[model samples]
Target chain A: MVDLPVIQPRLCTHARWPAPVYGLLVDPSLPSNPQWQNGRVHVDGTLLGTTPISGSWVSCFAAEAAYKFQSGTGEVATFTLIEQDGSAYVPGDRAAPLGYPDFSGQLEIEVQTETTKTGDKLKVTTFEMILGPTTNADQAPYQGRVFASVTAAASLDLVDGRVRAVPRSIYGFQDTIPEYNDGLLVPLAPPIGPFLPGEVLLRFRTYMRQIDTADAAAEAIDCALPQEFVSWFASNAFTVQSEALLLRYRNTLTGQLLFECKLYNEGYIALSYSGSGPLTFPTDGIFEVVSWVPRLYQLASVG
Target chain B: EDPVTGPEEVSGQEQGSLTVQCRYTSGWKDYKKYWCQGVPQRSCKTLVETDASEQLVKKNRVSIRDNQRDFIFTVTMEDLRMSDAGIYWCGITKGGLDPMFKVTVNIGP
Candidate 1:
């Protein structure tokens, strides 16, 4: 699969005049207009690899993963990773059979990382999750397409003040979603919906760059407060890859951390995260992405 | 610290009313109690009494509300006048003059 940048918020609806053509719209402006573009299997997205299916899959129903690193004064920096998957197919000329059965699955996940009271140790937490045929690859899903639906989803906020689980649209805080800023939202839904049977792997990335502390209010060389937040194109020191597609829960194993590109800052830190598994199809699926769960956490600080 | 007193002087002739609010963090609660008016050495005048149960308030044109859950305060004043214009501060006794709220009232006839 090609790298999944911050997936913007969009809506998708089922294709009309069909019992299971299940189409989606990739828009986030109009909720009523949930539709998706017919994504090309070879170009825009392609199954690159999958690991051996062995470890138990741990899903809150809502699964999450994240990368955390950096800091000299004790500890600093952390971000969450969360994603959903969907499936459906176009009418290939004519109907083949009643149910040849399209291989389908998705696992919604979330993760959280927080510092202890002393601001030293970090704690990883998890939340409950969702199930079924929902969300579109290009558009957000409507009620009819899936088994069930969730309206007015709120942001996921961890009890501890550290990591927060908030809806992507509340204030445009979503991981990879774009900000409309024109004082208007397209009124769309999630990027993908009414997913069909087959593997729809979800991947996410996030990072926090340390330029100057919040207390340093003065302009650097001269620019707005946001200017300090530079533009990052690719991973710092990580490359995502895997080869297995199946379902399991309450399990996690270490996968090789692709080198160099995933590095965030200097030797002070580096980051990457992924949480995967399989989900059922045709059933009403509700993938609730909650928080980030960091399995391999590291922070090295010195004077 | 000492309550942050705005320019210790009062212009009694001002017209508009004022809205004062309470906002605090962790522990230290309400700090300043009295509301004063003056200029170039402002004078202190007692508007609303500050207590656990009783909150200081001005009549009619003045309103106070808070989104308690987030611990935020909002105050509004109606029909302000030139006399209503002056630096107002939300003072607390917690040393270092940590003013909770402050606004300059403007009277517009």
Candidate 2:
């Protein structure tokens, strides 16, 4: 058997939150020989490790799943390794509006092998996807990538025994019912609700294929990705680089709600003794006013 | 997933005290040793330790002894609570090592 260098994704946690995310391990740089047709991107010489918290062992993992980058301009969606059904999870839910339905998809995986300097066959499993173009052009390839008007529905599971339905499309909450100005395609408006303290909102970063390097201008007409074809270069952007967490309420400073919290990830503001905290979000845009387990939090008044 | 090495298991009785030792490869002798509690080991909460030293230090009811010369660090929990019944690990915070020494603690009546 050819032994391969482990390609473990870089993982981070905030306190002992039950689950963690994947993909920061895959190297964004392309291989030495670029192919006319897209080839598998190798995340060489890495291994992923997880400590099973909910059960005796890691029963199964969702290593592969259909992914939609640019799910929203700044919303990346995914799940993780779970030992059993009772294991707690978050960002597993999304908001659903009238006429909107839910959706799900499967992931494909591949294993590539190579010979290292030690003369042993090294293998790495690469995740592949046909990333469609985010741009919209009448000719052939599209222009700048934008949110999909519609998307396969998604959801996130929460630690509190509840699930949140992720917005169905990148355009979710964009042109919808109730927030924005009358009939203008403006940035989304804040939810029509009161601010609750100590609520857990699944902050979503954007997922796009090769976002840092995949430029619309770089590809030729023939090579330009179709607006809907999946691609291998998927990445997240726009969200704060920090741990996923449960934020608590401390106070409200000006317009931003002050949250007193522990285990809050970097970039996420928290409420402090002086009523000041780490982060402050405007009332609108994608991350404003959504909860991972709205049902449980509301039922138990967890906020 | 990489398999963490150590004794397959360790057990302690209710309301009793015992020492949980984590033996490490010589390479980790100089690293910091930590005691954390949780099942499946990954979500273990770090137990507060009393001080930094080769001498046994006590924090509340939990005591930690680091023997770097012997490449081992031991945690002793006295008056164990029912909540103490779970998996505990003696781990190294150093990067790139298996780092976990898993132990199962059972509280008996």
Candidate 3:
């Protein structure tokens, strides 16, 4: 029997149906949103030649394979090579079944990268993992559609090739939703009632651009804040001496650098100090400027 | 870190009262406490406060208290609505970075 590409069912729900089909029959080169369009497989996502699957998949039946790549900086990126028997229909058709008996399986996966303090070394960490499912679309409003479930997953660590069980942290410091800008990120919940799975969820990206140095000792460490933050700060008028200032964070006591972002000197700025400490500068926690630099011209000197 | 304790999940009936508790480090004892509902930390609008003489607050259906002696703050929402079924942050308005806790509120019959 030829190992034909078995088109799997929709992974996302009907409302936000997961399409992005890749692997055997589908073209990996096509732009992201991989699904059925006008009787043919298509994608509108802007994925490069080798695209990354930034979403979830319910690996049921069709041949499944997982691949992993490593970075010298301890980053693990994963790619799953899934295949199935050829001649399966696209998931857009809710009526047709793949006609496979007991080929059902589920694995909820999440992959993300973050800047964390692992040991004295201030480094970045990337995590890729698969957990169990919380809700399957087949059991919800529309049967046999997709699985928009929940996951309380775990990971196993190995030191020199031995399995070491480490407690996977389910909660930690997560930036607030930038779009909503409402509150800090709370752990997203698996939909209980009728809800689209992917739409209401938020997770860290596979690559978290460096923020700034929090380890005060590493003043040499440069800030790599995202552009969005710069825009937000600039618009909010976070400036030093009439120049847009990059903001950084530090511990209140030990004066250890925590997180920092390079301030963009958009143009002339209005420098002002809101809090107090010592030496014309001393702040802590969030938005408490740790250091300052001249951004705009010295009005007195110019005169 | 100004620590706060929030339950992972909570459910309340319609038109009921849902109270979320947040405990902070001794350092936050004197800091003003407040409650807001939204995400992305900064955008959470203040719904109630232990004291808001200098801060914006909406006290119509919410009340907050700073029990400094107990090292805890309380936010109580009365007459909960389905619209209230989402995520919330309990925070202390301290100088520098404020401390916050997440509370997921679920509303059902």
Candidate 4:
């Protein structure tokens, strides 16, 4: 009898909302609400520890469809692993192998715009394995299930959810530079519509990936998924009606209001009231309009 | 097609090289493009980036070039090391949230 290496599967530590997600504003007053449109979620899978065996292994095959969001979890989104080539697998490098078990891939699921109340969550209940040369079909691929969840509600509230539109100049002098005004939330005036106070007008979730480095301890780095804009006053208004819109960020601490010129549609002014009649906003709001500030770091040189 | 797109995953061997080509729409031809390292996209560090010009930029063993006419930007990593294995982004810098595509680079023995 041959002694087979024991491979342990780890939970998904890294996940993200990579792009902006759009959905109709579910009337909170209604008895029941429709599910939000499906959005893509990125999740990175890792091994609990280093592999017992050492060598290059390919992800020859996987049953992506078999993996799904567990039922009764209140998760509207389904789970599907993004496809990968055969070469995408874990490498046996002892020096730097933290969270490097090679099971990282993207997953798409239905996400809600409201804050996830207690007990309601998106859970990955099923466990599947990627077949490789080291493991035979007859034997169980490995022990341990890959589980993850988006436990927090995904929404950003401006004002009481009702924003008073301020001028584009509030972002201050460095307004042109988006990074300069991180974490600033501003409310745009009417015509843009009314947002419910204390309720979230924008929704999104946060995720992190674990990276092991030689110089530092294993780190769980944070990142945000795309955002979905929801408003009772203008449900699907942005997607159906608006030609272009201008979004500004205000740093509450510094009192700096900044306008992101890059958001202009082909260099044209994004927000204007030129056309007569009711206005509409884009389905997908301006990307990254929330309080998340992206941290910039110097890249290390590879010799 | 998305405004920006690239391979979901790519692999290279030790002491070898790998190249990634990211495609974008014509509207972003003049925008700055970058190659960064990190997961979750938002926190990725810029390794090399073009200065809004078509010229190629290189930092250490990594290099990036943008072809405005082709609406494509290419990134090349040479002298691959095991430590280089991880998640990266093919990103375009802009006013609002930067458009990016996630790429997983695997280093094999």
Q: Which regions of candidate 4 deviate over 4 angstroms?
A: A1-303
Best by lDDT: 4
Lowest summed lDDT across 10 adjacent residues in model 1 chain A is found at A220-229
How much of the real interface does each model capture, measured as fnat?
Answer: 0.00, 0.00, 0.00, 0.00
Off by over 4 Å in 2: A1-303, B1-6, B48-52, B96-98
| iRMS per model in Å | 24.8, 18.6, 16.1, 19.7
lDDT tens readout by residue for model 4, A182-279: 22221111121122232112222222222223433322111111211111111222221122222343343454543221121111112212222322
TM-score of 2: 0.31
Who wins the TM-score comparison?
A: 4
The reply for model 3, stretches above 4 Å from the true place, is A1-303, B52-58
Q: Sort by TM-score, best first: what order?
A: 4, 2, 3, 1
Q: What is the fraction of true interface contacts found in candidate 4?
A: 0.00
Q: State each model's C-alpha RMSD to the native.
A: 24.5, 24.4, 26.4, 25.7
Model 4 interface Cα RMSD in Å: 19.7
For candidate 3 chain B, which ten residues in a row score worst on lDDT?
Answer: B49-58
Between prediction 3 and prediction 4, the one with superior lDDT is: 4
The per-residue C-alpha lDDT of model 1 at residue A170 equals 14
Give the better candidate number (1 or 2) by DockQ. Answer: 1
Better of 1 and 4 by TM-score: 4
